[PDB]
Amino acid sequence: AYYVGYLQPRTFLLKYNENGTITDAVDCALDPLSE
Amino acid sequence: GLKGTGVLTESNKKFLPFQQFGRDIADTTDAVRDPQTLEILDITPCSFG
């Protein structure tokens, strides 16, 4: 099975760790808790 | 092309193999890759007060 998504102009708050690896993110237009 | 002033000490930063610049809290470049030897070098501005 193969999966196709589509890209939208969207703001994220990226959680960089101490090693420089993005470990988590918040989709800033998902829900009002994310805002 | 990245112009700046500071001391070029050893960074001790674990860059990913594609990464070239290091930023910490702002638009300043905290760490930079050497273009020739690929050693990761810190940028600390010269001592002030």
PDB file of C-alpha atoms in Angstrom:
ATOM      1  CA  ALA A   1       0.000   0.000   0.000  1.00  0.00           C
ATOM      2  CA  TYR A   2       1.205   3.481  -0.914  1.00  0.00           C
ATOM      3  CA  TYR A   3       0.061   6.806   0.454  1.00  0.00           C
ATOM      4  CA  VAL A   4      -0.362  10.195  -1.237  1.00  0.00           C
ATOM      5  CA  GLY A   5      -0.756  13.427   0.708  1.00  0.00           C
ATOM      6  CA  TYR A   6      -0.864  17.051  -0.354  1.00  0.00           C
ATOM      7  CA  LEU A   7       1.059  20.036   0.943  1.00  0.00           C
ATOM      8  CA  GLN A   8      -0.435  23.210   2.409  1.00  0.00           C
ATOM      9  CA  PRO A   9       1.180  26.482   3.547  1.00  0.00           C
ATOM     10  CA  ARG A  10       1.053  25.923   7.286  1.00  0.00           C
ATOM     11  CA  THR A  11       2.826  27.246  10.387  1.00  0.00           C
ATOM     12  CA  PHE A  12       4.489  24.800  12.803  1.00  0.00           C
ATOM     13  CA  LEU A  13       6.248  25.083  16.150  1.00  0.00           C
ATOM     14  CA  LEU A  14       9.058  22.529  15.875  1.00  0.00           C
ATOM     15  CA  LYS A  15      10.509  20.820  18.961  1.00  0.00           C
ATOM     16  CA  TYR A  16      14.254  20.556  18.395  1.00  0.00           C
ATOM     17  CA  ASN A  17      16.043  18.430  20.981  1.00  0.00           C
ATOM     18  CA  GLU A  18      19.578  18.811  22.349  1.00  0.00           C
ATOM     19  CA  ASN A  19      20.915  16.706  19.446  1.00  0.00           C
ATOM     20  CA  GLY A  20      19.283  18.895  16.797  1.00  0.00           C
ATOM     21  CA  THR A  21      16.615  16.303  15.975  1.00  0.00           C
ATOM     22  CA  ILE A  22      13.012  17.443  15.535  1.00  0.00           C
ATOM     23  CA  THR A  23      11.112  15.275  18.017  1.00  0.00           C
ATOM     24  CA  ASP A  24       7.642  16.874  18.086  1.00  0.00           C
ATOM     25  CA  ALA A  25       5.565  19.547  16.365  1.00  0.00           C
ATOM     26  CA  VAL A  26       2.347  21.537  16.766  1.00  0.00           C
ATOM     27  CA  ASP A  27       0.142  22.235  13.741  1.00  0.00           C
ATOM     28  CA  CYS A  28      -0.769  25.847  14.545  1.00  0.00           C
ATOM     29  CA  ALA A  29      -4.049  25.788  12.573  1.00  0.00           C
ATOM     30  CA  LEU A  30      -5.355  22.400  13.755  1.00  0.00           C
ATOM     31  CA  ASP A  31      -7.554  23.164  16.774  1.00  0.00           C
ATOM     32  CA  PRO A  32      -7.741  26.137  19.234  1.00  0.00           C
ATOM     33  CA  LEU A  33      -5.580  24.287  21.766  1.00  0.00           C
ATOM     34  CA  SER A  34      -2.887  24.223  19.077  1.00  0.00           C
ATOM     35  CA  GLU A  35      -3.349  27.958  18.478  1.00  0.00           C
TER      36      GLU A  35
ATOM     37  CA  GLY B   1      29.504  35.009   2.117  1.00  0.00           C
ATOM     38  CA  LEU B   2      28.453  34.889   5.780  1.00  0.00           C
ATOM     39  CA  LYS B   3      30.149  37.970   7.237  1.00  0.00           C
ATOM     40  CA  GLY B   4      30.766  38.355  10.944  1.00  0.00           C
ATOM     41  CA  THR B   5      33.195  39.092  13.743  1.00  0.00           C
ATOM     42  CA  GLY B   6      34.147  36.780  16.580  1.00  0.00           C
ATOM     43  CA  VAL B   7      36.430  34.040  17.862  1.00  0.00           C
ATOM     44  CA  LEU B   8      36.394  30.764  15.919  1.00  0.00           C
ATOM     45  CA  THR B   9      36.632  28.189  18.690  1.00  0.00           C
ATOM     46  CA  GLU B  10      35.719  24.512  18.565  1.00  0.00           C
ATOM     47  CA  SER B  11      31.938  24.228  18.530  1.00  0.00           C
ATOM     48  CA  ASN B  12      31.193  20.815  20.102  1.00  0.00           C
ATOM     49  CA  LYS B  13      27.980  20.821  18.044  1.00  0.00           C
ATOM     50  CA  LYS B  14      26.598  17.641  16.470  1.00  0.00           C
ATOM     51  CA  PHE B  15      25.529  18.888  13.058  1.00  0.00           C
ATOM     52  CA  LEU B  16      23.516  16.690  10.749  1.00  0.00           C
ATOM     53  CA  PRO B  17      25.466  15.883   7.520  1.00  0.00           C
ATOM     54  CA  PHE B  18      23.413  18.344   5.452  1.00  0.00           C
ATOM     55  CA  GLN B  19      23.547  21.190   7.991  1.00  0.00           C
ATOM     56  CA  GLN B  20      25.845  24.180   7.491  1.00  0.00           C
ATOM     57  CA  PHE B  21      24.807  26.760  10.108  1.00  0.00           C
ATOM     58  CA  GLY B  22      23.910  26.728  13.790  1.00  0.00           C
ATOM     59  CA  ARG B  23      21.468  29.075  15.509  1.00  0.00           C
ATOM     60  CA  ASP B  24      20.540  29.175  19.176  1.00  0.00           C
ATOM     61  CA  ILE B  25      17.935  31.808  20.139  1.00  0.00           C
ATOM     62  CA  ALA B  26      17.950  34.446  17.379  1.00  0.00           C
ATOM     63  CA  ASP B  27      19.164  35.361  13.879  1.00  0.00           C
ATOM     64  CA  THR B  28      22.797  35.030  15.031  1.00  0.00           C
ATOM     65  CA  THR B  29      24.865  32.148  13.691  1.00  0.00           C
ATOM     66  CA  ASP B  30      26.191  30.309  16.746  1.00  0.00           C
ATOM     67  CA  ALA B  31      28.078  27.561  14.888  1.00  0.00           C
ATOM     68  CA  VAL B  32      29.347  27.222  11.321  1.00  0.00           C
ATOM     69  CA  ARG B  33      30.829  24.398   9.239  1.00  0.00           C
ATOM     70  CA  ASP B  34      34.324  24.871   7.811  1.00  0.00           C
ATOM     71  CA  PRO B  35      33.953  24.909   3.990  1.00  0.00           C
ATOM     72  CA  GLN B  36      37.228  23.005   3.457  1.00  0.00           C
ATOM     73  CA  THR B  37      37.729  20.510   6.307  1.00  0.00           C
ATOM     74  CA  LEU B  38      34.034  20.133   7.354  1.00  0.00           C
ATOM     75  CA  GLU B  39      34.961  20.870  10.974  1.00  0.00           C
ATOM     76  CA  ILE B  40      32.141  22.504  12.919  1.00  0.00           C
ATOM     77  CA  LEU B  41      33.329  25.826  14.342  1.00  0.00           C
ATOM     78  CA  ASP B  42      31.717  28.017  16.984  1.00  0.00           C
ATOM     79  CA  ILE B  43      31.041  31.721  16.528  1.00  0.00           C
ATOM     80  CA  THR B  44      31.373  33.604  19.800  1.00  0.00           C
ATOM     81  CA  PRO B  45      31.561  37.410  19.400  1.00  0.00           C
ATOM     82  CA  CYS B  46      34.637  39.099  20.839  1.00  0.00           C
ATOM     83  CA  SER B  47      34.705  40.013  24.522  1.00  0.00           C
ATOM     84  CA  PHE B  48      32.758  43.123  25.449  1.00  0.00           C
ATOM     85  CA  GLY B  49      31.086  44.948  28.297  1.00  0.00           C
TER      86      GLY B  49
END
